[PDB]
């Protein structure tokens, strides 16, 4: 199978970049060329958005209904499923996770544009919302409007998916929006605007520009008809787009990613915990913004945990994503690559013990492959243990008490996610409440439902997307208060 | 006879750690009638600290909404029972009428009790179950508290718009540092004697006065401090937002408007006039959802604008304590100068002064303007465009109604606007149309805690007040476990 060559998707149909420049696709798992994406700038980004206000401004979009909306939404779910081998096949090749990694990715695609048509039509009823006021003069009520023309910006480590979850809600306020998919992984992305010619959404409500950051994704934030920003991505490059957008004091909701702690009581089901640890570090191939990248085990089972985690680990098949039980595949590009090595490099030059992994995989010559890689005798001030590595590596640290590793759990910047492990509930209920964090995952690692809200606090961000909080972030929220008394307001003197 | 307060931080008063401070003026003598101390970065890195030690300990953030409501309501309780002192500081410092000043006191008291509710509310909210699709695993949904905040509020409703700010963020369960503006800070610094004595722990909410760059600035950039909430103007906002970006820290802005009044051919005149009068004249012309901007029809254009002027003429401009006042000084010199300079500025762009213009002719000394109205209006005009500050209405005609929807939206803000007009379906329509996060129908500027506040564009972005306020100061924490205790499945088994 080979793979498409797409244009610019810009009001309905396929243009060109306006300065014409493309730049390649390359498959993670051989390090070859494999195709191109066009590349956008600030002139494509431009008219994008002019025809985005242009569809804003229409009779068939934003003030229509949440329900009219919803058929749309509940079209594209079913579109996607309909191609649902064609997506997750290129979603493979391009973003170099595992086939059966893949497939949950493009059902979670269509269960977020379901979920979301659902949520339209709840909007409708929530419409002209009374607000009881003090005084019978007055009466109130509250509109929720789409805000208008928004911008998208999503990350590679799941490119149709986390685009989704952002689309779907804007979509269904009745906001029109550009999106601008990671250069790394923006095959999906630019066939989903096929999705969206072949169920008739009106031209310009989405708009698909991929590029370069600074040339795509920078002049989408700093653009004065931009009323809003979603980004998902690095809390660096989250750092940078915040200052843009503070220009035009121009809203905006960040997830940055994290350090998410993952802390093991003494009693536990050792086997199935592991393959939670396993789980929460290393599938997506370690590029999880959730990532529970640090280990608190209770010393008590340590020795024993560690044991079995290498066990679990090293039948991990590492693989071409699409063999036959691949169970991890290459990081995404080059760049990463070094970058994960140069982070266990620095690892063992500060002084740790890279006990499993950390190298290539012999048996694999080509592509951006790493081993499943454990680190212990872990000091709180080493590099990785405070710095996101967005590869598989795992760092591992013992605890004595409760109370310390609530503290050691939260000794980090970033607060994301978290997991805690322990058969007791009681004590998991206590650890639930203390982290610091946005997401707390009982007795699991990892699992994101669109039911639920989603996002962190500290550097990891703000705001929260999905569930019943997702549709919010895209509204104007309009409090309308009327006079129905009819008599003189009897502040000021008359003459 | 006004206090002598130091820094309220840890529930103590403390003395600047620079030990300066700055003058407090009458806006209508001119005269300098005490002072306020005057933070600096140190004060405040203290004043964090003591926030957040405040935050861990076991008396306040993780107790809950109902047990921090009876202290929102001890606060309420005696603000109400301290109401002559704040409203008579509160009229001598910031310069609105005394009967202005009255409503604005009865209103944080009323707001102090609205959040105590909404407390309590928001403890039945905690663990909201959230149904997933999966048997193995259950959802819910914990309400917990950012942290540490820093409230930044301005001097137009001095302790209304602090209040605005503490009762949500309190209410939340966050400790605050609070940075009043150094034009009006003195009801303020008083309220953290109200604090100690209905018991309010030490470091649950700390007031620094001080100038914006010596003690907001490093409020608003300290890495400890989780969110910052702020009101006023749209270029300061810009300021805080970039500087927060530094560290990615939340932030809501509120940044005040141009907003446009519209004023249809069938209202009652005198009604309509009046309210039109409130919407840009009141708080001395000081209010950041002023309906500066008068979209009336042409056919009843000229009738309106004499009617107007003659109920702008007996509006009684006396010092604000005097009795009948409906009409004080502007703020400070600072803000009289460039209030004047905006109106000359608009007589040489070729505006003509319809009424006022000038100093109030009986009042020598104060910072005195009469209620202005200004009339041939191009809309390149500085003051069609810029947020004035001050008692200065600007006036324009419109025929259609696509017409004045056009007019009205054309505006880089979009606070809040108003609407008149006795066909309640053309109100409706031009509701929907306008860009803006409040509209009023058939009034202009009743704001009730109940109902959701804040603006869209240039005016900022979040809402306040109502069912709102609370969550800006919220951790929305997922919590999903894994009830089945069976294996996940997805990699081999050793
Ligand atoms: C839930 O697991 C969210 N991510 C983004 C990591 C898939
Ligand atoms: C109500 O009018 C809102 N303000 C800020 C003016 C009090």
């Given at each position: 199978?080979?793979?498409?060559?797409?244009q610019?998707?810009?009001?309905?149909?396929?243009?060109?970049?306006?300065?014409?420049?493309?730049?390649?696709?390359?498959?993670?798992?051989?390090?070859?060329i494999?195709?191109?994406?066009?590349?956008?700038?600030?002139?494509?980004?431009?008219?994008?958005?002019?025809?985005?206000?242009?569809?804003?401004?229409?009779?068939?979009?934003?003030?229509?209904?949440?329900?009219?909306?919803?058929?749309?939404?509940?079209?594209?779910?079913?579109?996607?499923?309909?191609?649902?081998?064609?997506?997750?096949?290129?979603?493979?090749?391009?973003?170099?996770?595992?086939?059966?990694?893949?497939?949950?990715?493009?059902?979670?695609?269509?269960?977020?544009?379901?979920?979301?048509?659902?949520?339209?039509?709840?909007?409708?009823?929530?419409?002209?919302?009374?607000?009881?006021?003090?005084?019978?003069?007055?009466?109130?009520?509250?509109?929720?409007?789409?805000?208008?023309?928004?911008?998208?910006?999503?990350?590679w480590?799941?490119?149709?998916?986390?685009?989704?979850?952002?689309?779907?809600?804007?979509?269904?306020?009745?906001?029109?929006?550009?999106?601008?998919?990671?250069?790394?992984?923006?095959?999906?992305?630019?066939?989903?605007?096929?999705?969206?010619?072949?169920?008739?959404?009106?031209?310009?409500?989405?708009?698909?520009?991929?590029?370069?950051?600074?040339?795509?994704?920078?002049?989408?934030?700093?653009?004065?008809?931009?009323?809003?920003?979603?980004?998902?991505?690095?809390?660096?490059?989250?750092?940078?787009?915040?200052?843009?957008?503070?220009?035009?004091?121009?809203?905006?909701?960040?997830?940055?990613?994290?350090?998410?702690?993952?802390?093991?009581?003494?009693?536990?089901?050792?086997?199935?915990?592991?393959?939670?640890?396993?789980?929460?570090?290393?599938?997506?191939?370690?590029?999880?913004?959730?990532?529970?990248?640090?280990?608190?085990?209770?010393?008590?089972?340590?020795?024993?945990?560690?044991?079995?985690?290498?066990?679990?680990?090293?039948?991990?098949?590492?693989?071409?994503?699409?063999?036959?039980?691949?169970?991890?595949?290459?990081?995404?590009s080059?760049g990463?690559?070094?970058?994960?090595?140069?982070?266990?490099?620095?690892?063992?030059?500060?002084?740790?013990?890279?006990?499993?992994?950390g190298?290539?995989?012999?048996?694999?010559?080509?592509?951006?492959?790493?081993?499943?890689?454990?680190?212990?005798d872990?000091?709180?001030?080493?590099?990785?243990?405070?710095?996101?590595?967005?590869?598989?590596?795992?760092?591992?640290?013992?605890?004595?008490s409760?109370?310390?590793?609530?503290?050691?759990?939260?000794?980090?910047?970033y607060?994301?996610?978290?997991?805690?492990?322990?058969?007791?509930?009681?004590?998991?209920?206590?650890?639930?409440?203390?982290?610091?964090?946005?997401?707390?995952?009982?007795?699991?690692?990892?699992?994101?439902?669109?039911?639920?809200?989603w996002?962190?606090?500290?550097?990891?961000?703000?705001?929260?997307?999905?569930?019943?909080?997702?549709?919010?972030?895209?509204?104007?929220?309009?409090?309308?208060?009327?006079?129905?008394?009819?008599?003189?307001?009897g502040?000021?003197?008359?003459?």
């Amino acid at each position: 199978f080979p793979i498409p060559a797409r244009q610019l998707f810009i009001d309905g149909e396929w243009r060109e970049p306006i300065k014409k420049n493309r730049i390649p696709v390359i498959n993670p798992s051989t390090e070859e060329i494999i195709g191109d994406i066009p590349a956008a700038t600030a002139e494509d980004v431009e008219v994008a958005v002019v025809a985005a206000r242009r569809a804003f401004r229409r009779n068939n979009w934003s003030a229509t209904s949440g329900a009219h909306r919803a058929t749309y939404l509940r079209a594209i779910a079913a579109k996607i499923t309909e191609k649902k081998d064609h997506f997750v096949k290129l979603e493979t090749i391009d973003s170099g996770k595992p086939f059966d990694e893949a497939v949950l990715d493009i059902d979670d695609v269509a269960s977020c544009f379901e979920y979301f048509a659902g949520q339209a039509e709840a909007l409708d009823g929530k419409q002209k919302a009374p607000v009881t006021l003090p005084m019978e003069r007055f009466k109130s009520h509250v509109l929720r409007q789409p805000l208008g023309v928004v911008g998208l910006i999503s990350p590679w480590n799941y490119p149709l998916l986390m685009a989704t979850w952002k689309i779907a809600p804007a979509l269904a306020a009745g906001c029109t929006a550009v999106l601008k998919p990671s250069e790394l992984a923006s095959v999906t992305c630019l066939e989903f605007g096929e999705v969206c010619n072949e169920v008739g959404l009106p031209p310009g409500v989405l708009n698909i520009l991929t590029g370069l950051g600074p040339d795509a994704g920078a002049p989408l934030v700093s653009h004065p008809d931009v009323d809003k920003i979603a980004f998902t991505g690095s809390s660096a490059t989250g750092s940078k787009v915040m200052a843009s957008a503070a220009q035009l004091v121009k809203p905006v909701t960040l997830e940055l990613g994290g350090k998410s702690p993952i802390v093991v009581f003494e009693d536990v089901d050792i086997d199935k915990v592991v393959e939670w640890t396993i789980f929460g570090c290393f599938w997506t191939n370690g590029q999880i913004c959730s990532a529970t990248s640090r280990l608190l085990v209770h010393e008590s089972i340590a020795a024993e945990f560690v044991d079995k985690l290498v066990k679990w680990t090293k039948n991990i098949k590492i693989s071409d994503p699409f063999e036959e039980g691949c169970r991890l595949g290459p990081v995404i590009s080059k760049g990463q690559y070094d970058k994960i090595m140069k982070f266990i490099s620095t690892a063992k030059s500060e002084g740790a013990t890279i006990l499993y992994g950390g190298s290539r995989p012999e048996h694999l010559k080509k592509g951006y492959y790493i081993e499943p890689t454990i680190v212990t005798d872990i000091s709180t001030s080493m590099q990785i243990w405070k710095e996101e590595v967005f590869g598989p590596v795992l760092c591992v640290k013992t605890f004595s008490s409760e109370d310390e590793a609530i503290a050691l759990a939260n000794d980090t910047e970033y607060g994301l996610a978290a997991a805690v492990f322990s058969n007791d509930l009681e004590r998991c209920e206590r650890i639930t409440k203390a982290l610091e964090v946005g997401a707390v995952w009982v007795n699991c690692s990892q699992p994101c439902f669109v039911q639920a809200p989603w996002g962190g606090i500290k550097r990891s961000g703000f705001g929260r997307e999905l569930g019943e909080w997702g549709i919010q972030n895209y509204l104007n929220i309009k409090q309308v208060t009327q006079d129905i008394s009819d008599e003189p307001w009897g502040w000021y003197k008359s003459p």
